[PDB]
C-alpha cells in the first residue's frame, strides 16, 4: 500500500525542509559570539549546610519561593520540609507509596506535591487550621510512573509521567483538564516558563518539546541528544533552556532560532547528567552527574568553571534559589548539601 | 523574635525523635524487587507469600519482607528499575518450560546483572513451572536443542541433586536451563553479588523460607565483606 510510502516521503521531505531552515539561520555559533566575553574564572563553592535525616536515597528536591524552605523526597516514604538557615525540620510527611520520584513546593507555600511509582500525584496541605499535614488530594489518571510535577498556582499542577504524556490538572476538582502527547518515551523532567504560560519537557527519546499550557499543543520539538534526557530547566528569561542526558553531555537550546545553541561536554566525563539548573543570572549552569559530584559550567563559553565534589553517591537533584544565593544538591547518599 | 527559634527547635526535636523511631522500622524490613514476565508466574509466587506498583508483606521467623511487584508500567524499564538499587534482593521468576522465550529471560537477567545501579544486588532466581518442563521434556515433541544448540553436548553436572523418582532427561533439561543463568551470574559477579537459583513449581509452599535463607546469606556476606574477611 503506497499510503505508508508516500507519508514516509512526505515526512522526509518536510523534515529535511525544517533541517535546511534550521540551517538557513545558523550564521555563526554561540562560542564565536562569546569569543570576546570574559571567562568567569574558577567558581569555588563550599558546603555551607549539610542536611541529615533522610534514611534512603534522595530522589527529588524542590526549593521554596521563601528561598529558605526546602521540600525533599527520599525513597523511604518521607517528605521532609526543611529550614535551610537553621537546618531544622519544619515537617516530616509519611507517604503511602515509598517510591517517590518527584516533589514540588507550591509557589504560595501552602501545599506540597509528590508522586512516584504509584502513578498518583499527591498534594498535601501544609497550612491547615485543624493542625495537621494531611493528604489534600490524590490526582490519578496516569498509566505510568510520575517523574516530575510543578505547580502553576495553588489550583493547577502540571505532571509528567512515564506513560509518555504530560497532564495539566485542576487540583480543586481532581480532574485532568489537559493532556500533552507526542513523546515516544518516558517523560523524565519538566520546566515551567517564567510566566508559566509555556513549559518544556524532556523524554527518554532524546527529544524535548515546548508545550502551550492553555491550549494543549506542542509548539516546537528539539533533538540533538544521543540518549535519554534526564533533566530539563529553563533559562531565566524563558527564551532558552538546557537539557542533560545519559550521553554525558548538556545542551542549551533556543526557542526562537529553534536549534541547539551549545553543548557542554568533556572527554573525562562519560557519565550521564541527572539534574540541571541555571543560576539567577544565567551565566552559570549547574549539572549533577553520575560520577557523584556536580559541575558548574560557564553557560556562555562551555568551559567548566567549577566542581561541587562532596557527595558519596549519585547526585539526584539540583536546585538554585529564587534569589540566587544557595544551591541545594540532593544525592543517593541521603544527604542534602547547600552550597554558596 | 528569639522565641520562634526555640519553638522551631522543639518541632525539630519531635520530628527527629520520630525519624529515629522510623529508622528502626526501615532498617528491620527487607525490600525485594519481584521481576518476571507474563508467563513466569509471579502472581502465584506472591500468592505463596501470604504473611502503578503492588506490595506484598510477609514474615519469616519474625523478620518482615516487603516485595514490590511493579506491574502497571509500560514495557520500557531502564529508568524506573534504578529505583531499586537498594533492595535486599531481586527475586527473578522465569518460565523455564517456555524455551522459545527463555532467551528473552536470559537477556533480561544479563541486563539486571550488568546494570551499573544493580551490579551489587543479588538475584534470587526462581525457575518456576517445573512440572510443565517435566511433562514437556517427557512428551518429546519439543527439543531444547532446537532453541539452544549447546544442549546436545551437555551432561548433568556433578553437584546435581535430582528429585526422587525423576527422569534423567528432566534433570539434564532443568540443570542446563539453570546453568544458562549461572554462566551469566559467574561471568561478571565477582563475589559482590550472587545468584541463588531454585527450582520451584506452582504448588511449592517453601518459597518464603528460601527467600529468607538467601537474604540471610546476602546479609552475612555483606558483614563478612565489611570486616574484609572475604
Amino acid at each position: 500500500q503506497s499510503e505508508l510510502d508516500q507519508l514516509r516521503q512526505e515526512a522526509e521531505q518536510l523534515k529535511n525542509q525544517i533541517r535546511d531552515a534550521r540551517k538557513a539561520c545558523a550564521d555563526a555559533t554561540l562560542s564565536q559570539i562569546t569569543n570576546n566575553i570574559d571567562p568567569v574564572g574558577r567558581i569555588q563553592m563550599r558546603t555551607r549546610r549539610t542536611l541529615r535525616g533522610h534514611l534512603a536515597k534522595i530522589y527529588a528536591m524542590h526549593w521554596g519561593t521563601d528561598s529558605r524552605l526546602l521540600v525533599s523526597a527520599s525513597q523511604d516514604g518521607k517528605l521532609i520540609i526543611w529550614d535551610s538557615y537553621t537546618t531544622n525540620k519544619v515537617h516530616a510527611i509519611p507517604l503511602r507509596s515509598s517510591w517517590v520520584m518527584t516533589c514540588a513546593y507550591a509557589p504560595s507555600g501552602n501545599y506540597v506535591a509528590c508522586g512516584g511509582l504509584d502513578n498518583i500525584c499527591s498534594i498535601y496541605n501544609l497550612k491547615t487550621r485543624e493542625g495537621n499535614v494531611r493528604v489534600s488530594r490524590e490526582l490519578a489518571g496516569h498509566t505510568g510512573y510520575l517523574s516530575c510535577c510543578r505547580f502553576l498556582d495553588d489550583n493547577q499542577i502540571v505532571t509528567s509521567s512515564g506513560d509518555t504524556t504530560c497532564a495539566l490538572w485542576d487540583i480543586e476538582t481532581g480532574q485532568q483538564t489537559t493532556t500533552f502527547t507526542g513523546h515516544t518515551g518516558d517523560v523524565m523532567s519538566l520546566s515551567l516558563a517564567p510566566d508559566t504560560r509555556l513549559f518544556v519537557s524532556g523524554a527518554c527519546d532524546a527529544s524535548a518539546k515546548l508545550w502551550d499550557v492553555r491550549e494543549g499543543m506542542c509548539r516546537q520539538t528539539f533533538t540533538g541528544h544521543e540518549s535519554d534526557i534526564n533533566a530539563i530547566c529553563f533559562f531565566p528569561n524563558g527564551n532558552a533552556f538546557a537539557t542533560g542526558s545519559d550521553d554525558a553531555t548538556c545542551r542549551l537550546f533556543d526557542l526562537r532560532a529553534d536549534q541547539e545553541l551549545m553543548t557542554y561536554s568533556h572527554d573525562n566525563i562519560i557519565c550521564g547528567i541527572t539534574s540541571v539548573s541555571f543560576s539567577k543570572s544565567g551565566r552559570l549552569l549547574l549539572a549533577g552527574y553520575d560520577d557523584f559530584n556536580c559541575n558548574v559550567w560557564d553557560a556562555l563559553k562551555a568551559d567548566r568553571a567549577g566542581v561541587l565534589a562532596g557527595h558519596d553517591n549519585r547526585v539526584s537533584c539540583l536546585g538554585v534559589t529564587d534569589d540566587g544565593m544557595a544551591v541545594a544538591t540532593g544525592s543517593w547518599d541521603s544527604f542534602l548539601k547547600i552550597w554558596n | 523574635q528569639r522565641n520562634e527559634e526555640k519553638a522551631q527547635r522543639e518541632a525539630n526535636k519531635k520530628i527527629e525523635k520520630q525519624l529515629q523511631k522510623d529508622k528502626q522500622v526501615y532498617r528491620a524490613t527487607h525490600r525485594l524487587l519481584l521481576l518476571g514476565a507474563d508467563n513466569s508466574g509471579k502472581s502465584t509466587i506472591v500468592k505463596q507469600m501470604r504473611i502503578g506498583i503492588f506490595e506484598t508483606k510477609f514474615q519469616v521467623d519474625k523478620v518482615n519482607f516487603h516485595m514490590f511487584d511493579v506491574g502497571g508500567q509500560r514495557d520500557e524499564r531502564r529508568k524506573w528499575i534504578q529505583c531499586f538499587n537498594d533492595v535486599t534482593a531481586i527475586i527473578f521468576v522465569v518460565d523455564s518450560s517456555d524455551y522459545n522465550r527463555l532467551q528473552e529471560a536470559l537477556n533480561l537477567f544479563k541486563s539486571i546483572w550488568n546494570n551499573r545501579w544493580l551490579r551489587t544486588i543479588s538475584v534470587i532466581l526462581f525457575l518456576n513451572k517445573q512440572d510443565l518442563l517435566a511433562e514437556k521434556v517427557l512428551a518429546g515433541k519439543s527439543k531444547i536443542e532446537d532453541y539452544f544448540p549447546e544442549f546436545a553436548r551437555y551432561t548433568t553436572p556433578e553437584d546435581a541433586t535430582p528429585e526422587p523418582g525423576e527422569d534423567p532427561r528432566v534433570t539434564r533439561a532443568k540443570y542446563f536451563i539453570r546453568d544458562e543463568f549461572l554462566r551469566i551470574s559467574t561471568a561478571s559477579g565477582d563475589g559482590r553479588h550472587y545468584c541463588y537459583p531454585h527450582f520451584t513449581c506452582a504448588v511449592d509452599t517453601e518459597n518464603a523460607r528460601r527467600i529468607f535463607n538467601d537474604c540471610r546469606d546476602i546479609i552475612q556476606r555483606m558483614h563478612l565483606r565489611q570486616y574484609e574477611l572475604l
Partner: nanobody, 128 residues
Framework: QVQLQESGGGLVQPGGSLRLSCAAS????????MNWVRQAPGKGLEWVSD????????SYTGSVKGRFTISRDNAKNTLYLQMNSLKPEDTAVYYC?????????????????????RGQGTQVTVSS
C-alpha cells in the same frame, strides 16, 4: 537526530544468503553496543544477535548460531548481519537496535514495542 536505516532483505528461497545493513547516524557509533532484533508475522519482537562496542564480544539467540554473523564497521558507522542458510522460520521484519546508554554492557528495552532508538526494519520473506 538519532537515525538507523536498514537495507537489504527481501525474497529468498530456503538455503539462500542475505546481507542486512544498518546505516547509523546522529551519534558516535563506536560507543554503543549494537543489536539485531526481529519480529515474525504474528508474534512479538525477539532478540537475534548483539555485538559490543569494539566488536570482540558477540552473541546470538541460539536458533541462528552458526548461520547468522553480526559485524560492525565503526569507521563506517554501519552494522551487518550475514545470513547463509535461511530457513522458512526467518521471514520477519528485521530491526537494527541501539543500546540505550553509551558506555554500558547492559542494553534494556531493545525488544520493546516502541523503543525509540530502533530502525524501521527490512522485510525478509523466505519462501519457495
Amino acid at each position: 537526530q538519532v537515525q538507523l536505516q536498514e537495507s537489504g532483505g527481501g525474497l529468498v528461497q530456503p538455503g539462500g544468503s542475505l546481507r542486512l545493513s544498518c546505516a547509523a547516524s546522529g551519534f558516535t557509533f563506536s560507543n554503543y553496543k549494537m543489536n539485531w532484533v526481529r519480529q515474525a508475522p504474528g508474534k512479538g519482537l525477539e532478540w537475534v544477535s548483539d555485538i559490543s562496542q569494539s566488536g570482540a564480544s558477540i552473541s546470538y539467540t541460539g536458533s541462528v548460531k552458526g548461520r547468522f554473523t553480526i559485524s560492525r564497521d565503526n569507521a563506517k558507522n554501519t552494522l551487518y548481519l550475514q545470513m547463509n542458510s535461511l530457513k522458512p522460520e526467518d521471514t520477519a521484519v528485521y530491526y537494527c537496535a541501539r543500546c540505550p546508554a553509551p558506555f554500558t554492557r547492559d542494553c534494556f528495552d531493545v525488544t520493546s514495542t516502541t523503543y525509540a532508538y530502533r530502525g524501521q526494519g527490512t522485510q525478509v520473506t523466505v519462501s519457495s
